Design a protein around this ligand. Sequence first.
Ligand SMILES: [Ca+2]
Ligand SMILES: [Ca+2]
Ligand SMILES: [Ca+2]
Ligand SMILES: [Ca+2]
Ligand SMILES: [Ca+2]
Ligand SMILES: [Ca+2]
Ligand SMILES: [Ca+2]
Ligand SMILES: [Ca+2]
Ligand code: NI
Ligand code: NI
Ligand code: NI
Ligand code: NI
Lengths: 203, 203, 203, 203
Amino acid sequence: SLSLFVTRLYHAPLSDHGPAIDAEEMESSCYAIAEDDEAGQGWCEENGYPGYTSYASLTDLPWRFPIFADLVKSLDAHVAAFAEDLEFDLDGRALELEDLWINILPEGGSHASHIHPHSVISGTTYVSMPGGTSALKLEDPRHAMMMAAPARRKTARDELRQFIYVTPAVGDVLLWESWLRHEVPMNMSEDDRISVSFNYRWA
Amino acid sequence: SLSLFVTRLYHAPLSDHGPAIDAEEMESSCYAIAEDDEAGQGWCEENGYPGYTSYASLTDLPWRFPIFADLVKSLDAHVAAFAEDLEFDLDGRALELEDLWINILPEGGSHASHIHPHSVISGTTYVSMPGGTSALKLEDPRHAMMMAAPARRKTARDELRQFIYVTPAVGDVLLWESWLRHEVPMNMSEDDRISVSFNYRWA
Amino acid sequence: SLSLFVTRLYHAPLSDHGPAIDAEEMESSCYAIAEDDEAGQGWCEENGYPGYTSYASLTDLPWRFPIFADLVKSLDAHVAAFAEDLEFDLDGRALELEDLWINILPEGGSHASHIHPHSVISGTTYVSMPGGTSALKLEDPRHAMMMAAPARRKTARDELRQFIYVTPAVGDVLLWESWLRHEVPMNMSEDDRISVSFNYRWA
Amino acid sequence: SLSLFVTRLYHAPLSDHGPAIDAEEMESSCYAIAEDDEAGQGWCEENGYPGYTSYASLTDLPWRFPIFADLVKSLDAHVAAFAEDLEFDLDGRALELEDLWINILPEGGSHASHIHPHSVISGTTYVSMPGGTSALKLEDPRHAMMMAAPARRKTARDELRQFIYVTPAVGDVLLWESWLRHEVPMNMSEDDRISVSFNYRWA
Ligand SMILES: [Ca+2]
Ligand SMILES: [Ca+2]
Ligand SMILES: [Ca+2]
Ligand SMILES: [Ca+2]
Ligand SMILES: [Ca+2]
Ligand SMILES: [Ca+2]
Ligand SMILES: [Ca+2]
Ligand SMILES: [Ca+2]
Ligand code: NI
Ligand code: NI
Ligand code: NI
Ligand code: NI
């Protein structure tokens, strides 16, 4: 019995790499951006978006805001070390940050099932975690292939489970390979869920 | 850094379970069947199929020949133990064998990349292994999803490769989940590569 | 330029086949079942289910309730005709109804991205359609494979679009092949969305 | 009853676009290249590869030989027209050619089932077509998902088959989206099956 074709999930505190980022300093940084983003607040109500995003609103956040430059600098090292875990042949060129956005998720807020095209590593760092429930649902890529295969026991190892629920603490970073189907479950607590998500490309 | 959504490959000597199956007795059994099955030879001639199979010409081989009944009994226990490794919820129903066929592959023969529909576990026991070449190439179920992803380094870990190569010895039995794409690569020595393949489904 | 490997979507009014089912008669039938289902109402609050379902509560609805027997009888013919469109080799055995459940979806209610294992044809008939928005999101099965492929134009044919939005009228039935990834979008209207979903198996 | 998520296969005579490419002149070009590329012959000998390829031994063939530059110009227009059939949003960037190689396949040669990573459009023009046998077997991207689904009838429509077989004439050029799994089946006549294959990616 041998383990093959493994999906790897990178879960580590942000303080393992890069510069120091004060957690309380960046909670308010996300709020000050959200409440100055007139076009972002405007787009979210127009689209029926459950919460706030800067994704289709503000692009270069590390250039505009100094703490985000420090965040990226830390994220680069997190990603580079994850690339080494994934044993990617990268030649000379490393993985570079492609997209980076902010998310504020109030009570009842969810993200649908989605992936991230034209990207190698995707990930999310966590600024505010109330509730103590799952901030990430993560689906088996082989799920569609398993149509005749019986369901797993209630009870099995996490290697085998077809849905993986992640409960990250504040200041944690989660990375995954960009093809991974992932979902952000409904915020069950009254207070906000603040996260910063990002994509890393190669060429 | 966690390992998720694992494909599990069972690999064990057939003598671990069931009654004694004499390797020399099994080899002559397959030759005797193949040279009496004139409809099987005829179907391989009419199709232009590389080698011999009993896949389209014979059905329940254990009902007909005593040594295959002794094989099936062993395979039952093999599969049931592999089902417990995979931790399927099987309820009342055990996994039963629906298909079992003989392959006799000569110098230059190949099988295209393929899966096995309406099955839970698929597998192959090996009767004749000449040469130092691979009898199975497994392909990553995630391969098509990895269109933007860089290739793994030549010296990467086994759980991270796109393609896995197995060189079984005589009397081995391999098992996999039926949706796993596999290829039987080209035989290189001038002696026959004999194997018995089989499909298990859920009642 | 040639069109291959097509996913087919069956969209037709329920009155094209089977017995007559009065629309107003069955709106209240679903309500009378939901408000008698003590175990179903109990399970939905316990699970945090956005709305009502009878799926993990009441099984044989055509046996218990006469209008649902008439519904199944009509659905059988809808499915059988769709099997002919799909050109399935079925031998003697037809497609039979495996599971059948009721769904009531109030304002804010959604279903996550999901498929239906151990099934051939899945579908939903629509009892109450306010809003005039989409009651079905339908995702490309090749979506995960298209990671390096650029996004389609705003503007293209529906063959090509990676997400298909369906706006069914009252009394419509939608059928699809069970492996299809599909989502029920958020109910934007104040009034309820009543639907009856079902699975069809083969063997 | 609608047709959704279509795979599109481009098939047209190479003379529809670009400059005049003499078929007899192209055949002798490939033979001249293959019998001078001693490193290419050597790489096929060292790998035990069925036939000849320039895939690992030569890079930019249009920069070196005039007739291939005249080929590339034609292929550019071919692909760009196929991109418009697929209706990609390409922005400022056109699709450029990154890889182009020669295949010379003899009596008995085959290529395994495979895709082309980091590419948008892949294709093959055909230089020599002896016999009445297939030069391409396409496999349904949905094949692994159809594990519970019944097989299509032998007499089913082309858009519904799991496998599609193409028999091009000389001077034809086929295109497909790069994620499409394809197999080049076994050559059956004692003359060479020559083809030029190529990969297009997005700038
Ligand atoms: Ca290298
Ligand atoms: Ca003996
Ligand atoms: Ca021997
Ligand atoms: Ca020899
Ligand atoms: Ca039949
Ligand atoms: Ca001429
Ligand atoms: Ca000739
Ligand atoms: Ca010959
Ligand atoms: Ni995301
Ligand atoms: Ni096989
Ligand atoms: Ni559903
Ligand atoms: Ni190719």
